[PDB]
Write an enzyme that holds these catalytic residues in place. Structure first.
Site, mmCIF file in Angstrom:
data_model
loop_
_atom_site.group_PDB
_atom_site.id
_atom_site.type_symbol
_atom_site.label_atom_id
_atom_site.label_comp_id
_atom_site.label_asym_id
_atom_site.label_seq_id
_atom_site.Cartn_x
_atom_site.Cartn_y
_atom_site.Cartn_z
ATOM 1 N N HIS A 191 0.933 -0.889 -0.573
ATOM 2 C CA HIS A 191 0.333 -0.449 0.066
ATOM 3 C C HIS A 191 0.848 1.802 -0.329
ATOM 4 O O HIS A 191 0.426 2.063 -0.831
ATOM 5 C CB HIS A 191 -0.548 -0.089 1.277
ATOM 6 C CG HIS A 191 -1.834 -0.998 1.318
ATOM 7 N ND1 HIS A 191 -2.083 -2.056 2.200
ATOM 8 C CD2 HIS A 191 -2.608 -1.557 0.097
ATOM 9 C CE1 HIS A 191 -2.464 -2.975 1.884
ATOM 10 N NE2 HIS A 191 -3.811 -3.013 1.350
ATOM 11 N N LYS A 200 -17.110 -6.528 8.568
ATOM 12 C CA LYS A 200 -16.099 -7.227 8.533
ATOM 13 C C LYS A 200 -15.059 -7.546 9.152
ATOM 14 O O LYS A 200 -14.092 -8.768 8.703
ATOM 15 C CB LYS A 200 -15.021 -6.757 6.611
ATOM 16 C CG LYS A 200 -15.862 -7.159 5.622
ATOM 17 C CD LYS A 200 -14.628 -6.877 4.754
ATOM 18 C CE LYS A 200 -14.740 -7.036 3.200
ATOM 19 N NZ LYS A 200 -14.278 -6.544 2.457
ATOM 20 N N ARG A 220 -2.234 -6.461 -9.075
ATOM 21 C CA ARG A 220 -1.066 -7.687 -7.802
ATOM 22 C C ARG A 220 -2.178 -8.732 -9.458
ATOM 23 O O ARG A 220 -1.207 -8.913 -9.826
ATOM 24 C CB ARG A 220 -0.993 -7.437 -6.457
ATOM 25 C CG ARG A 220 -2.025 -8.297 -6.116
ATOM 26 C CD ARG A 220 -2.586 -8.363 -4.600
ATOM 27 N NE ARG A 220 -3.524 -8.791 -3.946
ATOM 28 C CZ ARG A 220 -4.197 -8.715 -2.580
ATOM 29 N NH1 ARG A 220 -3.280 -6.899 -1.973
ATOM 30 N NH2 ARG A 220 -5.469 -8.428 -2.741
ATOM 31 N N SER A 250 -3.021 -7.836 2.765
ATOM 32 C CA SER A 250 -3.771 -7.487 4.836
ATOM 33 C C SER A 250 -3.805 -8.552 5.249
ATOM 34 O O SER A 250 -3.151 -8.748 6.672
ATOM 35 C CB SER A 250 -4.214 -5.855 4.346
ATOM 36 O OG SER A 250 -3.277 -4.974 3.976
HETATM 37 C C1 LIG Z 1 -12.763 -0.258 -6.570
HETATM 38 O O1 LIG Z 1 -13.651 -0.183 -6.036
HETATM 39 C C2 LIG Z 1 -13.697 0.279 -3.874
HETATM 40 C C3 LIG Z 1 -12.746 0.948 -2.744
HETATM 41 C C4 LIG Z 1 -12.729 0.629 -1.961
HETATM 42 C C5 LIG Z 1 -13.269 0.640 -1.264
HETATM 43 O O2 LIG Z 1 -13.473 0.301 0.102
HETATM 44 C C6 LIG Z 1 -14.043 -0.281 1.277
HETATM 45 C C7 LIG Z 1 -13.870 -1.112 1.541
HETATM 46 C C8 LIG Z 1 -14.457 -1.564 2.028
HETATM 47 C C9 LIG Z 1 -15.609 -1.626 2.855
HETATM 48 C C10 LIG Z 1 -16.778 -0.081 2.163
HETATM 49 C C11 LIG Z 1 -18.116 0.642 3.141
HETATM 50 C C12 LIG Z 1 -17.172 1.517 3.774
HETATM 51 N N1 LIG Z 1 -18.860 1.298 1.564
HETATM 52 C C13 LIG Z 1 -18.548 0.753 0.489
HETATM 53 N N2 LIG Z 1 -18.472 1.722 -1.339
HETATM 54 C C14 LIG Z 1 -18.565 0.764 -1.894
HETATM 55 N N3 LIG Z 1 -18.670 -0.523 -1.575
HETATM 56 N N4 LIG Z 1 -18.294 -0.460 -0.225
HETATM 57 C C15 LIG Z 1 -18.485 -2.221 -1.924
HETATM 58 O O3 LIG Z 1 -19.021 -3.457 -1.583
HETATM 59 C C16 LIG Z 1 -18.474 -1.427 -3.561
HETATM 60 C C17 LIG Z 1 -18.670 -0.363 -4.375
HETATM 61 C C18 LIG Z 1 -18.503 -0.405 -5.620
HETATM 62 N N5 LIG Z 1 -18.815 0.383 -3.256
HETATM 63 C C19 LIG Z 1 -14.875 0.356 1.758
HETATM 64 C C20 LIG Z 1 -14.863 0.305 -2.086
HETATM 65 C C21 LIG Z 1 -14.687 0.231 -2.741
#
Ligand SMILES: COc1ccc(Oc2cccc([C@@H](C)Nc3nc4n(n3)C(=O)CC(C)=N4)c2)cc1
Ligand SMILES: COc1ccc(Oc2cccc([C@@H](C)Nc3nc4n(n3)C(=O)CC(C)=N4)c2)cc1
Ligand SMILES: COc1ccc(Oc2cccc([C@@H](C)Nc3nc4n(n3)C(=O)CC(C)=N4)c2)cc1
Ligand SMILES: COc1ccc(Oc2cccc([C@@H](C)Nc3nc4n(n3)C(=O)CC(C)=N4)c2)cc1
Ligand SMILES: COc1ccc(Oc2cccc([C@@H](C)Nc3nc4n(n3)C(=O)CC(C)=N4)c2)cc1
Ligand SMILES: COc1ccc(Oc2cccc([C@@H](C)Nc3nc4n(n3)C(=O)CC(C)=N4)c2)cc1
Lengths: 160, 160, 160, 160, 160, 160
Positions: free
Chosen positions: F18, F42, F91, F129
């Site tokens: 990262h 999670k 990756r 991670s």
């Molecule tokens: C490349 O897309 C990403 C990259 C990183 C991200 O970060 C996270 C990681 C875990 C949890 C969340 C929660 C808080 N919000 C969220 N927003 C989303 N989420 N979940 C999805 O499941 C799918 C989507 C298109 N948008 C965000 C979310 C999406």
């Protein structure tokens, strides 16, 4: 050839990707059984009864679709539905590799049930029920990806 | 070269795919340690003691196999078993990509432990312990995929 | 053990990735035959005599490597050499798919020859003889990827 | 139904994998056109007349197969033949990626032609006409992978 | 910022997928060099002068695009152009594997050049210059995949 | 172009992979928001507050990084941060396929947010991670893979 095809899955909830696949199957086969697996161990968002009702409403415009629920081994349910065609949708490599394992297993369980893979429109090639639920639970707009009845049911389910 | 190879995994339960890989390893190396990881966090179907007993019975016909259990970091257990060869089975791309990450990690942990990938018969190239358990819990016939002792133990475990 | 292993290919030219794989093979098997195919590679930049001389000089420090040219089907040569281990290197998914097809074919041709896949260092996990030749032919620096003797022969080849 | 399906390719030569796929297609569609491209394959070992005669003899036992040569864009021929089903075989990931590109292109060219992917037996999941030709040209045994008539024609071709 | 980006390739011919990628690049970098390799593509249908003129006309509406021919190793040209960003397009897995190899090689050749992968619209995620040429050469409609000027030049090229 | 880029993820905990990606992003864009998703469903090892503090300390040497936490839909948080660039790390194929689905979904949610994929050093191309936590909870040495502050925090977290 009076062909009966089965299209099984959890459909939790049924998406426009699933509607696309089942529509292609109805243009090819005389009768399509859209089979919804209960799978309570996976903790579905919608009950089996809810999924069956949503899918019936979303496929009501297709005259040769029959929506049913099952908790059996999928291949036994397909034999019991007199299906000889097993519809699968092909989107990504990760899904394809797992579908290859399931198809070889299903062929050992019921060799006369022929696995056929149909390819959805590019429009739905990157969606899944899981991805739509994830976006929706974070209040993202998923109207484009679901039948109207399903979209309103999903919003209601997440509103508590 | 008095070569000692380790073949680690959860083996929950050991399948004909695993028997195939361990048989190929015994034809190549003088001594093979079939190492069963306890992994209670993953909630295995069989206890570690049950998995060790099933694997011992299923490999009893191979004179140079030693079945043992472990809860350690796999690489530390391999060093402690004086192994210099790490057996992996190669079936699908999804497994291959994850195995590549584990092999680079294992090489950082124990550089003298050489990861070797063996390829099972086409007969077992689409099976996994998880897939066999899924089919069996839905009452599908999995006799073809498991050693006799394992098949009877799996049926007993699912019968409650 | 007294295991005889074969590591075949065009080696046009032999790279640090091939040296890495053949070195790992010498650490686990008593005798390693580095088998150079008489057939032209997709290029084929170096003649068989050049490829053999380069591989011999680059593996001279490894006491249990034998560099040998062959023109037959690889399995026919492995059979006549009494090899029971067939060394393959695995870098990525594209490699994996094609190597799986070849391994099932080699097992059909010579079942007593066991395919073993070794993983090179991360350092060489993104190179091939083809890529090295394309970069060098287009005036790019490939010194890091080659044994010194190969680097010298490649500059001489590109100069004329 | 009265479905007309097309199964196109170079079939240079037709293998047991192609016989497996065309047999599965005849079990689900009323009429199957096994369409042989006049264009040379990556080789091209057998002439169009040889490829047609070999495919005809190897599918003679299947009453609803029609073997036909074509030189046009495949979709143009499928259109003129009134085919509404396009048979493809899926063996591995490399196949999948390229077949997905072709299926989206064929849908743009002829949307009334539905691509259907069938899976061959595990027995033929690691062969291609290309691999069979390379092994046979290099003096390897490919008898198991071919219909008897094809095996006879291939030996005759390699002898001259 | 004052970032200079390079988007290299054969562009034989430039498609709507390339226009999509170069447009996205102009939205994030101050200056984009659309670099056309003098070398022939797997075909090579259009000459360098034709490829440059077609790309110039098709990107004329983008104020910060510079269309330039090059014959050197791409990294040597990127270096002399003071580019610090290297634009790549990612459509599928097959693309990804090869692009990863090239990106690690380009980083070794010119570490100050950062590879950036952009994703085209779903509309162009299943096309390539190669596929477009094969379809058009075989009398298939490719109008939708090309800028109007390219469509006109391709028809003119195929007519003679 | 006063470009603002967002680099979102769970960063549980932030690794050297990262750090590599965020460092490459800071060399390309004027301002980088490293956005940490709370994701309590999670069951993360570190609290959101802990992850934000670890990432702030690990990126303190980069003057144009801003570390923030979010629980929103990622695309809404990116719009609210005035970001027009979405950084992703590339990756493995399994990650790439899932990233392709997310990028098409994010483009439907916020079309002006351009997904850009950066490639980490070969050194961190096989780490995650999750993999680092798995090795660490089995007492394997993970000092090489994490910033010093993160490594000491991870050891403390696992010591109970
Ligand atoms: C490349 O897309 C990403 C990259 C990183 C991200 O970060 C996270 C990681 C875990 C949890 C969340 C929660 C808080 N919000 C969220 N927003 C989303 N989420 N979940 C999805 O499941 C799918 C989507 C298109 N948008 C965000 C979310 C999406
Ligand atoms: C292509 O193979 C399929 C496709 C859809 C399926 O539908 C589902 C979905 C979730 C749960 C179930 C349960 C009720 N029955 C079941 N039958 C199975 N199951 N699970 C497996 O895990 C593997 C297997 C070969 N057969 C079925 C099952 C298998
Ligand atoms: C090819 O690498 C392997 C192969 C088989 C293995 O066996 C298992 C299976 C389940 C659980 C465990 C536990 C007890 N020990 C352990 N050691 C690890 N673990 N987990 C990882 O998660 C990653 C890693 C590099 N080393 C080991 C572990 C790693
Ligand atoms: C893992 O399988 C291998 C590995 C390395 C090999 O080396 C080469 C390289 C280039 C040319 C040849 C020629 C001389 N003989 C040969 N033998 C083959 N060939 N070609 C095939 O195309 C397929 C096949 C299964 N066996 C051999 C051949 C096969
Ligand atoms: C699944 O798509 C298929 C399947 C089998 C095919 O059969 C062949 C094999 C070799 C040569 C040809 C020639 C005569 N015509 C043709 N038609 C094409 N061609 N080439 C392409 O390159 C791409 C494309 C979409 N259509 C056809 C063609 C396309
Ligand atoms: C992402 O890497 C790229 C992207 C686009 C490129 O454009 C082309 C296309 C065709 C031909 C050439 C010729 C003129 N020069 C060249 N430079 C190279 N070449 N070939 C390789 O084969 C490998 C490599 C790392 N660098 C360049 C080259 C490399």
């Amino acid at each position: 050839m009076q062909k009966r095809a089965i299209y099984p899955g959890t459909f939790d909830p049924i998406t426009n990707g699933h509607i696309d696949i089942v529509t292609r199957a109805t243009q090819m086969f005389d009768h399509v059984i859209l089979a919804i697996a209960a799978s309570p161990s996976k903790k579905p968002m919608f009950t089996l009864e809810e999924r069956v009702a949503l899918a019936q409403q979303a496929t009501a415009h297709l005259g040769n679709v029959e929506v049913v629920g099952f908790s059996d081994l999928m291949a036994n349910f397909a034999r019991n539905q007199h299906a000889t065609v097993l519809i699968r949708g092909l989107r990504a490599v990760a899904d394809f590799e797992y579908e290859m394992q399931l198809a070889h297993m299903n062929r050992h369980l019921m060799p006369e049930l022929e696995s056929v893979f149909l390819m959805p429109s590019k429009e739905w090639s990157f969606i899944s029920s899981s991805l739509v639920k994830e976006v929706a639970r974070h209040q993202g707009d998923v109207t484009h990806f679901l039948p109207e009845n399903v979209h309103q049911a999903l919003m209601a389910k997440l509103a508590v």
